[PDB]
Structure formats: structure tokens, C-alpha cells
Design a protein around this ligand. Structure first.
Ligand code: CLA
Ligand code: CLA
Ligand code: CLA
Ligand code: CLA
Ligand code: CLA
Ligand code: CLA
Ligand code: CLA
Ligand SMILES: CCCCCCCCCCCCCCCC(=O)OC[C@H](COP(=O)(O)OC[C@@H](O)CO)OC(=O)CCCCCCCCCCCCCCC
Ligand SMILES: CC1=C(/C=C/C(C)=C/C=C/C(C)=C/C=C/C=C(C)/C=C/C=C(C)/C=C/C2=C(C)CCCC2(C)C)C(C)(C)CCC1
Ligand SMILES: CC1=C(/C=C/C(C)=C/C=C/C(C)=C/C=C/C=C(C)/C=C/C=C(C)/C=C/C2=C(C)CCCC2(C)C)C(C)(C)CCC1
Ligand SMILES: CC1=C(C/C=C(\C)CCC[C@H](C)CCC[C@H](C)CCCC(C)C)C(=O)c2ccccc2C1=O
Lengths: 131, 69, 739, 69, 108
């Protein structure tokens, strides 16, 4: 074959997380499955900035710290679109036509990522500075 | 806990423990899928019967870690 | 799942009058007197005549409620006779000096001299049941609180007796309701042991802790509050151990370290009472609860999760063992008998474990110094322990006789044990003869070296030393354990491994029990006689069906007397007679275990403490050289301590002198049945029925002898009737006076 | 307000207002059922598009009642 | 040999992960001292990286003479714990302590 047959390759309980994440999933539209990614990566990214920052013990640490978290995401949706210009030159048609093989929804992935990538970010700033 | 509460940072230890449980207690359940199903028939990739155990297992592991540190 | 049929048994009195309705041997009429005994012998073994596994499991289920009733009737008599006729408030005033007494005796011939002076303004029989030290820990301060209980033990006796009625006469369950083992194991672990200790953990803090904070401050049984105030007046409960100001919120934000005054890990003995710290026993039964309720969710029911036991035996199989435990889950879901023996074995062996864990760790206030009770509380459960264990050897053989199936058992673990059963027995045979010479024969060497005037050539301390180098090291790790491995404890699990002598007044609560050269011997006696008691019961179970002698032993049943004078003579071959043989050896086993207790506890543990703390024991340390010989077991122990019960006529301790005499009688009365046989006596009734046929009234019930198993059964049941009751009074009279 | 907080009893006024809105703002919506549907495809007798409006209408009515009393 | 990429590529990752999170913790520590921000470096009076496993192991081995090694008079060494020892005027052994600077080098 091509791959190897261990006793734990292609095991069910890890495939249940694999084929149900919002990037390998079945029916989600590429505007929406980029939201669940952007809601995911955004909420924790304001973790490291607010307890490990240049100023941590001020008014002032969660507020400024969380500007850099949305300030990181805007460099990521940039890096998503430069991947869109360079991998999808016209979204050249390929073997699967996923969101990922052939593009077709990439700036709907990109715009979907930025919604939670600002939305989930300040939600933790709500949950950290208040509550 | 430099940006949060002292009894607020236990909730990260307790809620990680539910995810620490079900990540390796979840694939150990042999007979899965036995009833009842979800309240609003939300087709979701586990059962409430199973998920109640993970929150129960997470509540025991989290008690072990919180009192352990 | 709940599965019940309606009204299977009608509440009609027609089967009350005519006896023997349940058998097809019975309901005919006694043409002989064997029918009177054949009725009373085969009453309750419902598997003998009900050939229906559903029907028998309902008769077992309801009769357990009836046995739940007669405890609650008897628990009423322990609670009503203590509220009404006790010196309990006199015992609550001065707990140390005043001995307990309940059962005031009536004013007739001189049995009212048993109402002797106990202390206070009360006269009665000195009780050795420990209920006074038990109820004091529970917090019972006035007779009135107990008064409702006996009522609550009576009404729950009525409720269980109705539940035995309702769950058999009206609504008796299905067979498949009984085979639901995993839902039964989940509930008994979670609900019965878990919540039942959780609720006792609640009663220990809400009721039993706070008054023992006050009684041990030395104030009164009068100015202390009542239990209902402790819940309501939350600042009365916040003055003693001031941690109830925070309430149930530290239990829920997991800052459990803020319970550091009423939930403890002291681990010693309460020095003002000599008993267990109740704040330790509260944190105990809390941790037992959470362990048991968590263990209550281990087994699989109809929600998918949980361990299935049938799936756990398959894939427990080895190269030595072949099929593993396959079929063994089906054994304890079809056979009640195998379920009885396994449950009995770990009920009796538990009953000896509690007896060992009570003297080294006194659980109760002023039970430690009350040597009248703390010796009797040991010796009861040791006998109850040894009795259920021979029951475990009994009903193992009954499962083997009929409920054994070779179809379900091919090359699994039940079959292969029967397929090397000689190698099991003959190796266990050798170790009895090894441990008879090298444990009992050492006492014989200790006689023939001491009587010959050579006390340097025996096995003692001042001679060849048989030192218990292992058990002296186990004390070396169970006493260095605290703070060296168990760092959060104050002291060790008990003081017996080492530490200071703890005393309440001048009586020792507990002191470090040394092990010397004599303790190696007597422990190896116990290793000897238990290994014989195992051997007779294991030979009864492994050869229950067949042997080289009789291949149809279980075709002849569980309880058949003999196979006659054939094969050279074959008597006492059955699985019943091995239990009959194993009852005396169990009597011979535990009697040494009780003797090893009642001397070492008197000689090396208990005694009178002077003001500086220099202990003087009761017999004053004479186990270390007396107990190595047979003579010193007779001279220094049995002759010395039998004095207290033969100089007791005209005392309040006088029925002890009577039962010591009265049980020497019935023991010898066994030997009329044991050493003899049937066919002498059934021949002798030919002469005695002649005296009633000469005068023309020889009865229609033909006056019969006993059967051979019965003559064995009466002979052992009167044998144990004597030797335990001989010791029962002998232990009572001796430790009351000098202890 | 006898057994609760002063800023806790506003939450009964706000959450009643969401139920006060959707009980008589709900049957006034003419075109219902337009997408999107619920997140886990829970078959539930309204849409998240509609229900977000009721929580928005309830947030306005609740602001009117709380500042009105 | 039939999975030799999974060995090497996971070994490749844990090499790079270790170089960033050990040596890069010095380049972080170089800069915060160069920029005069000693509240931002990784030190003992700073963001501490405490070696708790090597202090629990150093603890349980120094409290073993008498608990789990009873017949030993003193411990296995004086490098885990205990008093110092001198010969002449110089120290034979003393407990080598492991703080944030010892965590930082043990990962290198
Ligand atoms: C030469 C250009 C340059 C400039 C002006 C800065 C400036 C900064 N860097 Mg530095 N950095 C640079 C190059 C630069 N960097 C390079 C080339 C490297 C690699 C060697 C680094 C490696 C580095 C690290 C590891 C860190 C910094 C940090 C910082 C900040 C310290 C003060 C602060 O956080 O206020 C507190 C204020 C905030 C955290 C919020 C300020 C505004 C944020 C940045 C943007 C908010 C979103 C905005 C609307 C949109 C995104 C902006 C983006 C498009 C430009 C300061 C903003 C520290 C930091 O805090 O990161 C954020 C920090 O940890 N830098
Ligand atoms: C009249 C208002 C009303 C109220 C107060 C409730 C109350 C409840 N519902 Mg119900 N329900 C209702 C009408 C209502 N229902 C209507 C109109 C529908 C169809 C759209 C449902 C569909 C529904 C489902 C599928 C379930 C509930 C459930 C519940 C319970 C869980 C708490 C909750 O989330 O409620 C808000 C709670 C008793 C859960 C339940 O069944 O609890 C046993 C549940 O699984 N509800
Ligand atoms: C969790 C609740 C619960 C509690 C507190 C109990 C308690 C008890 N059960 Mg159990 N039992 C339970 C659930 C429970 N059961 C369930 C759900 C089943 C069916 C699967 C059983 C099936 C069962 C049987 C067959 C028997 C008991 C018996 C008993 C009694 C044991 C005797 C004793 O120690 O006192 C005790 C009262 C025994 C008994 O003595 O009944 C009177 C007995 O024979 N139980
Ligand atoms: C099943 C056994 C049991 C029962 C019936 C109770 C019952 C009670 N507890 Mg108790 N409790 C228990 C076990 C139990 N507890 C155990 C095991 C602990 C130690 C963890 C406690 C520690 C505790 C505290 C600290 C308090 C109670 C209190 C109470 C009372 C009110 C609880 C409430 O309503 O909120 C109630 C009588 C409250 C009370 O009224 O104290 C006087 C209270 O403050 N309990
Ligand atoms: C006190 C009287 C007594 C004695 C001494 C014995 C002895 C024995 N019983 Mg018996 N038993 C007794 C009463 C007694 N029983 C009674 C009353 C019953 C009725 C309930 C039984 C029912 C019973 C059963 C059911 C079983 C035994 C078994 C045994 C043997 C156990 C193994 C052993 O210890 O070998 C070593 C022997 C001794 C300790 C005997 C004393 C030997 C001395 C100390 C050494 C000899 C000195 C010297 C060398 C002798 C030679 C010199 C001389 C010839 C000149 C042992 C021979 C068991 C058995 O046979 O297992 C293999 C067994 O299963 N007995
Ligand atoms: C690996 C863990 C993981 C994490 C952190 C998330 C995170 C999220 N999920 Mg997803 N999801 C996952 C795996 C995960 N998912 C898996 C394995 C399934 C199948 C059982 C789903 C099925 C699912 C659905 C149907 C939906 C989400 C939604 C969400 C978002 C809402 C918050 C929430 O309730 O999450 C916990 C959040 C970003 C919602 C969403 O799509 O947000 C855009 C939503 O509607 N999840
Ligand atoms: C000091 C000089 C030096 C440095 C920095 C390196 C670095 C490296 N060597 Mg090399 N090597 C060297 C000398 C050096 N080597 C020499 C002299 C030889 C000849 C014998 C080799 C032969 C050799 C072999 C045979 C191998 C390596 C490998 C490696 C890599 C190891 C994994 C790692 O730590 O990644 C993390 C990277 C670092 C720790 C580098 C420093 C990065 C800093 C701390 C962070 C960057 C700061 C900032 C973000 C930078 C950008 C700022 C800007 C964009 C504004 C690493 C890149 C191995 C490898 O590739 O494994 C995967 C490997 O197998 N090297
Ligand atoms: C003791 C060691 C021991 O128990 O070995 C274990 C061995 C069985 O080992 P296996 O793993 O083969 O058995 C698996 C089963 O025990 C469980 O199904 O049992 C025997 O050897 C019986 C011992 C008879 C007594 C010999 C002495
Ligand atoms: C411990 C552990 C673990 C875990 C970890 C992880 C995985 C984590 C993650 C987690 C996460 C990561 C989480 C998440 C969350 C999120 C959230 C919860 C958020 C929220 C959001 C939101 C809220 C949003 C929305 C919005 C928008 C979009 C806009 C508009 C507005 C709003 C804001 C609404 C594991 C399993 C590995 C293993 C074992 C151990
Ligand atoms: C069973 C159980 C449980 C559960 C339960 C729960 C948790 C519940 C909750 C509860 C809830 C959560 C409920 C709620 C409900 C509500 C209600 C009851 C409401 C009503 C109201 C009304 C209806 C009103 C309204 C209105 C207005 C205001 C105006 C307009 C009109 C209307 C009428 C609409 C638990 C877990 C504990 C445990 C176990 C047992
Ligand atoms: C003495 C003896 C008998 C004879 C003893 C018998 C049959 C028991 C007779 C005594 C009982 C106690 C008589 C029962 C008394 C009546 C029931 C009295 C009724 C009066 C009412 C008021 C209750 C045996 O049958 C026997 C069998 C096998 C081995 C040894 C022996 C053995 O040693």
C-alpha cells in the first residue's frame, strides 16, 4: 500500500474528532466554517498577551493585551489572503474542490475567520476585565 | 492568575479536566449510543448519557488536580 | 428494570394448620418420629422442594425481610431496656469509675442478688455489650431520645415484616430482576455503603461531634445543649470548632483545607477518653462514602457506560488456567448457594478483622479502659467470624453437590481446581503435619526441657530464641510510618506498634504490644489450626461429588450419613460431615485465638497506672515465659483465672459461676451423642415401647431414634453450646473483678 | 427583592421582557423561517434569526421598564 | 526502518521546540537585561521557571535516610539535602540547589 498498519492508525475515537472539526466537516458553507475556526483560535489568543505582556499590572493589562490579540488576527487574515492570492490563482480546479483544494470560498473563509477573530477576542476581554 | 480571581482560576482547572477526561475517557467507552438522546434532538457527536459521565469524571479528576496543587 | 407479577401467594391460613405443605415427601403424616425432625430440618432450604428458580428466589427475598425484622425487634430490646432500666445517666455523670448496668432483675428467690452495687444509685447486671460507650459517642444524653428509637426499631420491624409480606404476597419480582447483578452492585455500593456512611458522616458532625467537644471539656450531662439546637443556633455550633461560619461554600469552592478543625487526620486515641477521635471518624466515614459512591458507578446498566462483569472474565484467561473465569459470572447468577458461601467467607473474615481493629484502635469513649467489655467485644465477633466461615465451607459444598454444572464448566477455573484436587489437598495435608510438629511440638519440647530441669534448652527468651523477625519489622514500618511516609498524621494508626502509654485515669487505654519468642509460637499455632480448618472444609468441597472411594457422593446428596461398612467401611464421607468435622476444629482454632488474646491483653496490655505513669499490669507480665509451655497455659493461665468464677457463689457475679458449671455439663452431654451411634438406641426403644405396649398405649407416632447425621448434628450443636458458654462466663467473671 | 440583589433583580425585568416581547412580537412576524437554522440542527419551534430579534426587542423593552421603574 | 520518518520528524520537532524554549529563553533574557527591564526577564526575582520536578526528586531523596532507607545513617549524598561538610577549611559537599537558572541550563 502507501501507508502503514499499526494498531492505532485510523482509530475511531480520534477520527470522531477528526471528521467533526469545522475544517473537515460535511455540510458547512465556507462563510460559516471559517467562523467556528475564528471563534476557536481567537478566544485563547488573548490568553498569553494579558498575563504575559510588557505591562501586566496596570489598568490596563487585559485591555491593551487584548488589542494585540485582535492585532494578531489581522496579521493572520492578511496571511490567509496572501495564501489565497498565491495558492488560488483564479481558484484553479483540483481533485476535490474543498474549501482547501480548489478555492471557491476563500474570501468567504477569510472574511468568516475575521468575524470570530475579532468577536471571540473581545468576548474574553469581557470575561477577563469584567466577570 | 495575575489578570483573574483566585476562585476564578479553579474553573480553568475544572473545565480542562472535563476535556482531559473525555479526550481519553471518551474513546474507552465500549457500548456507546444507548439512550436517551439530546433534549432538542440536536444531532451531536456524543450522547448526553455519555457526556454526563465525562463531566462526572472531569469533576473527580479536577478535584484531584485542584487539591493536588 | 422493574418486572413484577401480581398476587403470587394468597394470604390464606389453610397452610398454617397442616404442617409440611412445602415438600412432596411431607404433607403425609408422621408414621415415625423422624418426620418431626425431617420437617424442622428441611424447612428453609427452599431449593430442596421448590424446583423453580424464580419461585425460590422470591422465598429467599421475602425471608430476608423477616430477618430484617427480628434484628429490629432485637435492636428495640437493646434500646428500650437501655432507656428504661439502665444507669446510663448515672454512667454519663461519671464515665470512668461507674461500670455500666442494664437488665435490673426481678425481686424473686435471690436472682435479685445479681442486682449488685455498680456505682451511683443503681444496682444491676454489669453489661459487657458496649452500648454505653457506643451511645455516648453518638451523643445520646437523656433516656428520652432513646425512647422513640425502640419505637422506631419496632415500627421499622413492622415495615420490613410488611415488606416481606408485600414483596411476596402481593408484588413479588421476576427472576430477571434478581439476575441484574450490575444494577444491584451499583446500588449496594452507592446507596447502601456509600450514602449509609455519608449519612452517618452527617450524623457524626451534626449530632455526635459537638456534644463530645463539650462532654470532654468536663462540664455536665445537664448544661450541655440538645442536638436540634446545633443545626439551628448556628453560633452555638460556631463557638466549637469555629469553621461553620463559612458553611457549605468551602465544600463547593473546593477549598477543603478550611475544614481543619472538625475534619482531621490526627490518628491517635482521644486521651481524655482513650478512644477514637470523632473528628477522625467523621472524616473517615466521609472518605468511605465518596470512595463507595464513586465505586457505585463502576458497573454497566442500560446507559452503556460501566464495566460488565461477563465481559471481564472472558479476557481474564491465562496459560496456566485455560479458559479463565468463563462461566463464573453465570455461577453467581444461577446458584444462590455459591453466592452464599462467597458472601459468608468475606462476612466472617470481616468479623475477625473488626475484632482486631477494635482493641488496637478503640472506637468509643471509655471503651478502652472498660476491660469488662473490650475483652468481650473481641471474643464475640471472633466467634461470629469463625461461625460464618464454616458456613462458607458448608454452602460451597452445597453448590458443588447439585448447582455445579460440568456443561458450563469445561476447562475453566472451577473445573481445573477439581482436576488437581489431590495436589491441592495433599500439599495442604503436608503443611498441617509440618505446622503440627513445628508449632505444637515446640510446646512439647518446651515441656520436656522445662520439666527435666533444663530451661536453657527450650525455646524461650533466655534459651534458643524463636524471634519473630518479620512482625517486629512490620511494627518498625507501621510506627515510623507517621510523619515519615504518612506526613499529615499526628500519630500512627494505633499505639500498639509503638508510642506513649495512653491512660484514662489509672487504667490503660492502649499500650505497645510487644512480640517476643512466645508470640512466634502461638501465632504459628494459629497458622497450624487454621490450615487444618481449611483442610477439612476444602476436602469436603473438592471431594463433594466424587473421589477414588465414592464416585456418586453428590448423587447421594449433600447430607447423607454414610455409604455403610463397604469399601472397608465408609462413615462420615459426605460433604455435611466435613462441616461437622470442621465445626470442632473451628472451636479448637478460635479458642486458642481467644486464649492468646485474654492472657496477652491481661498480662502485656492492661493494668493499673500510678501517677508518674509507671504501668503495672494485671497478671504482671507472665505471658513471656508461662505461655511457651503447655503447663504454663494450664498453671499460670487456666488455673489462675478460673478462680474468679468458682469463688462467686453468693455474689452478683453468680450466674457466671452457674453458666461455667452449666456449660461444662452440656459439653459432656454431647459425648452421649457423638461417641455413640443410632442402632443401639433404636434397639433400646423396642424395650421402651414395650412398656407402653404392655400397658396398651404405645403411640401411633412410632417413637424413633435420631438419624445418624442428626446424632452428629445434635452432638456438635451441644458441643459448641458448652465450650463457648464455658468461656463466655469465664471471660465475664475474671475481667470484671481484676480488670 | 427581599431575598436577592439590587442589580440581580434587574435580570428578572430583562428576561421577562424577552418573554413579553416574543409572546406578542413573535406572532407578528410575517415571513418567518428564513435562514440560517440552529447551530446543531436542533429542530426547535423558531429560528435563530427570529429569536435574535426577540432578544433585541426584549433588550429595548427591558431598558424601558428598568429605567421606567 | 519502516517508520523512520515518524521517528526523525518528531525528533526534528522536539529539537526545534527545545531550542526555542531553552535557548530563546536566554535571548529573551539577554534583551530584557539590555533594555533594562529585569521585571521582564526569566529569573528568580522575575517570571520564575521553577524546576518543581527536580526539586521534588531532590526532596524525596534527601528525606530517605530513616523513612525508606532506615539503616542508612545519613543520606545517599549531601547533594540532595542536609548539612554541609568541611575538610580542612574547604567544603566537601553541600546541597546543590536548583532554581530558575538551573532549570534554564538543564533544558539546554
Ligand atoms: C520596528 C517596528 C516595531 C515597533 C514600532 C514595535 C513595537 C512594539 N513591539 Mg515589537 N517587534 C518588532 C518590531 C516592532 N515592534 C520586530 C521586528 C520583532 C521581532 C524581533 C518584535 C518582537 C516583539 C515581541 C516579542 C513583543 C514586541 C512588543 C512591542 C510593543 C511594546 C509596547 C506595548 O505592547 O504596548 C501595549 C500595547 C499593546 C499590546 C497594544 C498596542 C497596539 C497593538 C500592537 C495593535 C492593536 C491592533 C491594531 C488596531 C491593528 C494591528 C496593528 C498592526 C496592523 C500594525 C510595541 C508596540 C511586545 C508586545 O506587547 O506585543 C504586542 C512584545 O511582546 N515586539
Ligand atoms: C411555555 C414556555 C415553556 C417553558 C417555561 C418550558 C420549560 C422547559 N422546557 Mg420546553 N418547550 C416549549 C415550552 C416551554 N418549555 C415549547 C413551546 C417548545 C417547542 C418550541 C419546547 C421544546 C422543548 C424541548 C425539546 C425541551 C424543552 C425542555 C424544557 C425544560 C428545560 C429548561 C429550558 O430550557 O426551558 C426554556 C423546561 C422545563 C427540555 C425538557 O424536555 O426538560 C425535561 C427539552 O429537552 N422544551
Ligand atoms: C440504593 C438503594 C438501596 C439500598 C439502601 C439497599 C439496601 C439493602 N438491600 Mg438492596 N437492592 C437495590 C438497592 C438498594 N438496596 C436494588 C436497586 C436492587 C435490585 C437490583 C437490590 C436487590 C437486593 C436483593 C436481592 C437484596 C437486597 C437486600 C438489601 C438489604 C441488605 C441487608 C442490610 O445490610 O440491611 C439492604 C436493606 C437484601 C435483603 O435483605 O432484602 C430484604 C437482599 O436479599 N437488595
Ligand atoms: C447525608 C448526610 C448529611 C445531611 C442530611 C446533612 C444536612 C445538613 N447539613 Mg451537613 N455536612 C455533611 C453531611 C450531611 N449534612 C458532611 C459529610 C459534612 C462535612 C463536609 C457536612 C458539613 C456541613 C456544613 C459546614 C454545614 C452543613 C449544614 C447542613 C444543614 C443544611 C444544609 C443546607 O440546607 O444547605 C443540613 C441539616 C449547614 C448547617 O446548617 O450547619 C449547622 C452548614 O453550614 N453540613
Ligand atoms: C488433642 C488431641 C488431638 C491430637 C494430638 C490430634 C492430632 C491431629 N489431628 Mg486430630 N482431631 C481431634 C483431636 C486431636 N487430633 C479431635 C477430637 C477430632 C474430632 C473433631 C479431630 C479431627 C481431625 C480432623 C478432621 C483432622 C485432624 C488432623 C490431625 C493431625 C494434624 C496434622 C499434625 O499436626 O501432625 C503432626 C502431629 C502432631 C502435632 C501430634 C503430636 C505429635 C508430637 C508433638 C510429636 C511426636 C513425639 C514423638 C516423636 C513420637 C514418637 C515417639 C514414641 C512413639 C515413643 C494431627 C495428627 C488432620 C489431618 O490428619 O491432617 C493431615 C485432619 O484433617 N483431626
Ligand atoms: C475540538 C473541540 C471543539 C471546540 C473547542 C469547538 C468550538 C466551537 N464549536 Mg464545535 N464541534 C466540534 C469540535 C469543537 N468545536 C466537534 C467534534 C463537533 C461534532 C460533535 C462540533 C459540532 C459543532 C456544531 C454543530 C456547532 C459547533 C459550534 C462551536 C463554537 C461555539 C461554542 C461551543 O459551544 O463549543 C463547544 C465553538 C467555536 C457552533 C458553531 O458552529 O460556531 C460557529 C455550532 O453551531 N460545534
Ligand atoms: C550558534 C550558531 C548556530 C545556531 C544558532 C544554529 C542553529 C541550529 N542548528 Mg546548527 N550548527 C552549527 C551552529 C548553529 N546552529 C554549526 C557550527 C554546525 C556545524 C557542526 C551546525 C550543524 C547542525 C546540524 C548537524 C544540525 C543543526 C541544527 C540546528 C537547528 C536546531 C533546532 C533549533 O534549535 O531551532 C530553533 C532555533 C534556534 C534556537 C535559533 C535561535 C533562534 C532565536 C533564539 C529566536 C529568533 C528570534 C527572532 C524571532 C528572529 C527573527 C527576528 C526578525 C524576523 C525581526 C538550529 C536552527 C539541527 C536541525 O536542523 O534540527 C532540526 C541539526 O540537525 N546544526
Ligand atoms: C502465586 C503465583 C500464581 O498465582 O501464578 C499465577 C498462575 C495463573 O497465571 P495465569 O496468568 O496463567 O492465570 C491467569 C488467571 O489466573 C486469570 O484468569 O496461577 C498458578 O500458577 C496457580 C498457583 C498455584 C499455587 C502455586 C504455588
Ligand atoms: C486541557 C486539555 C485539552 C483541552 C484544551 C483545548 C483544546 C482547549 C481549547 C479550548 C478553546 C479554544 C475554547 C474555545 C472557546 C470559545 C469561546 C467560548 C468563545 C466564544 C465566542 C463567541 C462568543 C463569539 C461570538 C461572537 C462573534 C463571532 C461576533 C459577534 C458577537 C459574538 C461575540 C457573540 C485537550 C482536549 C487537548 C486534551 C486534554 C487536556
Ligand atoms: C429534575 C432535576 C434537575 C433539573 C431541573 C432544573 C435545573 C430546572 C431548572 C428550572 C428552570 C430553569 C425553570 C424555569 C422555568 C421558568 C418559568 C416557569 C417561567 C414562567 C414564566 C412565565 C410563563 C411568564 C412569562 C410571561 C411574561 C412575563 C409576560 C408576557 C407573557 C408571559 C406569560 C410569556 C436537576 C438538574 C436540578 C437535578 C436532578 C433533578
Ligand atoms: C440418646 C440417643 C438417642 C435417643 C434420644 C432421642 C431419640 C431424643 C429423645 C429426647 C427428646 C428431647 C424427646 C422430646 C420430648 C418431647 C417432644 C416432649 C413433649 C412435651 C411437651 C410439653 C413439649 C438417639 O436417637 C441417637 C441417635 C444417634 C446417635 C446417638 C443417639 C443417642 O445417643
Amino acid at each position: 500500500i502507501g501507508h502503514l498498519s499499526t494498531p492505532i492508525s485510523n482509530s475511531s475515537a480520534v477520527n470522531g474528532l477528526l471528521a467533526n472539526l469545522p475544517a473537515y466537516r460535511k455540510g458547512l458553507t465556507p462563510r460559516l466554517r471559517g467562523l467556528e475556526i475564528g471563534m476557536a483560535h481567537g478566544y485563547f489568543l488573548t490568553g498569553p498577551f494579558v498575563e504575559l505582556g510588557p505591562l501586566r499590572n496596570t489598568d490596563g493589562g487585559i485591555l491593551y493585551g487584548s488589542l494585540s490579540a485582535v492585532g494578531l488576527v489581522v496579521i493572520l487574515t492578511a496571511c490567509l489572503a496572501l495564501y489565497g492570492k498565491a495558492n488560488f490563482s483564479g481558484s484553479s480546479k483540483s481533485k476535490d474542490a474543498t474549501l482547501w483544494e480548489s478555492g471557491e470560498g476563500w474570501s468567504d473563509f477569510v472574511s468568516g475567520w475575521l468575524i470570530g477573530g475579532a468577536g471571540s477576542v473581545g468576548f474574553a476581554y469581557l470575561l477577563l476585565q469584567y466577570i | 492568575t495575575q489578570s483573574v480571581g483566585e476562585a476564578a482560576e479553579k474553573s480553568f482547572v475544572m473545565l480542562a479536566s472535563v476535556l482531559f477526561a473525555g479526550a481519553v475517557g471518551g474513546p474507552g467507552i465500549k457500548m456507546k449510543g444507548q439512550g436517551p438522546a439530546w433534549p432538542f434532538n440536536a444531532q451531536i457527536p456524543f450522547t448526553p448519557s455519555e457526556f454526563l459521565a465525562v463531566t462526572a469524571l472531569g469533576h473527580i479528576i479536577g478535584t484531584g488536580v485542584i487539591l493536588g496543587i | 428494570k422493574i418486572v413484577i407479577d401480581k398476587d403470587p401467594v394468597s394470604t390464606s391460613f389453610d397452610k398454617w394448620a397442616v404442617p409440611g405443605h412445602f415438600s412432596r415427601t411431607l404433607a403425609k403424616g408422621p408414621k415415625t418420629t423422624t418426620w418431626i425432625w425431617n420437617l424442622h430440618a428441611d424447612v428453609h432450604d427452599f431449593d430442596s422442594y421448590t424446583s423453580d428458580l424464580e419461585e425460590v428466589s422470591r422465598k429467599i427475598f421475602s425471608a430476608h425481610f423477616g430477618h430484617l425484622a427480628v434484628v429490629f425487634i432485637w435492636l428495640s430490646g437493646a434500646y428500650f431496656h437501655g432507656a428504661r432500666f439502665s444507669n446510663y445517666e448515672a454512667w454519663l455523670s461519671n464515665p470512668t469509675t461507674i461500670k455500666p448496668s442494664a437488665q435490673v432483675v426481678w425481686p424473686i428467690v435471690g436472682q435479685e442478688i445479681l442486682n449488685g452495687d455498680v456505682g451511683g444509685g443503681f444496682q444491676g447486671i454489669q453489661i459487657t455489650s458496649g452500648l454505653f460507650q457506643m451511645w455516648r459517642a453518638s451523643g445520646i444524653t437523656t433516656e428520652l431520645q432513646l425512647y422513640v428509637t425502640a419505637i422506631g426499631a419496632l415500627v421499622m420491624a413492622a415495615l420490613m415484616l410488611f415488606a416481606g409480606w408485600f414483596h411476596y404476597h402481593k408484588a413479588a419480582p421476576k427472576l430477571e430482576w434478581f439476575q441484574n447483578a450490575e444494577s444491584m452492585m451499583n446500588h449496594h455500593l452507592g446507596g447502601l455503603f456509600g450514602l449509609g456512611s455519608l449519612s452517618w458522616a452527617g450524623h457524626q458532625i451534626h449530632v455526635s461531634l459537638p456534644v463530645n467537644k463539650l462532654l470532654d471539656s468536663g462540664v455536665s450531662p445537664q448544661e450541655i445543649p440538645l442536638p436540634h439546637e446545633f443545626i439551628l443556633n448556628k453560633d452555638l455550633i460556631a463557638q466549637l470548632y469555629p469553621s461553620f461560619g463559612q458553611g457549605l461554600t468551602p465544600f463547593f469552592t473546593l477549598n477543603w483545607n478550611e475544614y481543619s478543625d472538625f475534619l482531621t487526620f490526627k490518628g491517635g486515641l482521644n486521651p481524655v477518653t482513650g478512644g477514637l477521635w470523632l473528628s477522625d471518624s467523621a472524616h473517615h466515614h466521609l472518605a468511605i462514602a465518596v470512595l463507595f459512591i464513586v465505586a457505585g458507578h463502576m458497573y454497566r446498566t442500560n446507559w452503556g457506560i460501566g464495566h460488565s462483569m461477563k465481559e471481564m472474565y472472558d479476557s481474564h484467561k491465562g496459560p496456566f488456567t485455560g479458559e479463565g473465569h468463563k462461566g463464573v459470572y453465570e455461577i453467581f447468577t444461577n446458584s444462590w448457594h455459591a453466592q452464599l458461601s462467597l458472601n459468608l467467607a468475606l462476612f466472617g473474615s470481616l468479623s475477625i478483622i473488626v475484632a482486631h481493629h477494635m482493641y488496637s484502635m478503640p472506637p468509643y469513649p471509655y471503651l478502652a479502659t472498660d476491660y469488662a467489655t473490650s475483652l468481650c467485644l473481641f471474643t464475640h465477633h471472633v466467634w461470629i467470624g469463625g461461625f460464618l466461615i464454616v458456613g462458607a465451607g458448608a454452602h460451597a459444598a452445597i453448590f458443588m453437590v447439585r448447582d455445579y454444572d460440568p456443561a458450563q464448566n469445561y476447562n475453566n477455573l472451577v473445573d481445573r481446581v477439581l482436576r488437581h484436587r489431590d495436589a491441592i489437598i495433599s500439599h495442604l495435608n503436608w503443611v498441617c503435619i509440618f505446622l503440627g510438629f513445628h508449632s505444637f511440638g515446640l510446646y512439647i519440647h518446651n515441656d520436656t526441657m522445662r520439666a527435666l530441669g533444663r530451661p536453657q534448652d527450650m525455646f524461650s527468651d533466655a534459651a534458643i530464641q524463636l524471634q519473630p523477625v518479620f512482625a517486629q519489622w512490620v511494627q518498625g514500618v507501621n510506627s515510623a510510618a507517621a510523619g515519615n511516609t504518612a506526613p499529615n498524621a499526628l500519630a500512627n494508626a494505633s499505639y500498639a506498634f509503638g508510642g506513649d502509654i495512653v491512660s484514662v485515669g489509672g487504667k490503660v487505654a492502649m499500650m505497645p504490644i510487644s512480640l517476643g519468642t512466645a508470640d512466634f509460637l502461638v501465632h504459628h499455632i494459629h497458622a497450624f489450626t487454621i490450615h487444618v480448618t481449611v483442610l477439612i472444609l476444602l476436602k469436603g468441597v473438592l471431594f463433594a461429588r466424587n473421589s477414588r472411594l465414592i464416585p456418586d457422593k453428590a448423587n447421594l446428596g449433600f447430607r447423607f450419613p454414610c455409604d455403610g461398612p463397604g469399601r472397608g467401611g465408609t462413615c462420615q464421607v459426605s460433604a455435611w460431615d466435613h462441616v461437622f468435622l470442621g465445626l470442632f476444629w473451628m472451636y479448637n482454632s478460635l479458642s486458642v485465638v481467644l486464649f492468646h488474646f485474654s492472657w496477652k491483653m491481661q498480662s502485656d496490655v492492661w493494668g493499673n497506672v500510678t501517677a508518674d505513669g509507671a504501668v503495672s499490669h494485671i497478671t504482671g507480665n507472665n505471658f513471656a515465659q508461662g505461655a511457651i509451655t503447655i503447663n504454663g497455659w494450664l498453671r499460670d493461665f487456666l488455673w489462675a483465672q478460673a478462680s474468679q468464677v468458682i469463688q462467686s457463689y453468693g455474689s452478683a457475679l453468680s450466674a457466671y459461676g452457674l453458666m461455667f458449671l452449666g456449660a461444662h455439663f452440656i459439653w459432656a452431654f454431647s459425648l452421649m451423642f457423638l461417641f455413640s451411634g443410632r442402632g443401639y438406641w433404636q434397639e433400646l426403644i423396642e424395650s421402651i415401647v414395650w412398656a407402653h405396649n404392655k400397658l396398651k398405649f404405645a403411640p401411633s407416632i412410632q417413637p424413633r431414634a435420631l438419624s445418624i447425621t442428626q446424632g452428629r448434628a445434635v452432638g456438635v450443636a451441644h458441643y459448641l453450646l458448652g465450650g463457648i458458654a464455658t468461656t463466655w462466663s469465664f471471660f465475664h467473671a475474671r475481667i470484671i473483678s481484676v480488670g
